[PDB]
Amino acid sequence: AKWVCKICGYIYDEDAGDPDNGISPGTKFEELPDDWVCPICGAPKSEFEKLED
């Protein structure tokens, strides 16, 4: 799945992960550590929304 940062528009793509910030490709959004933040704007996990209906 993909999740958008509601603040800045960064897309957390589970297939990409976020390796520069310690997250291997394939990591689901729920599994990101509680203190992971948007790598662009620093928003907390609460500010992301899943891109699905």
Cβ contact 49:3 at 8 Å: yes
Taking CB under 5 A as the criterion, the residue among 4, 14, 43, 45 binding Fe ion is 43
Which residues does the annotation place in the binding site for Fe cation?
Answer: 5, 8, 38, 41
Distance CA 2, CA 16 (A): 10
Q: Could you give the string, one character per residue 10-39, with x where binding to Fe ion holds by CB under 5 A and - elsewhere?
A: x---------------------------x-
* Token output for 27: 């990591």
The footprint of Fe ion (CB under 5 A) covers 5, 7-8, 10, 38, 40-41, 43
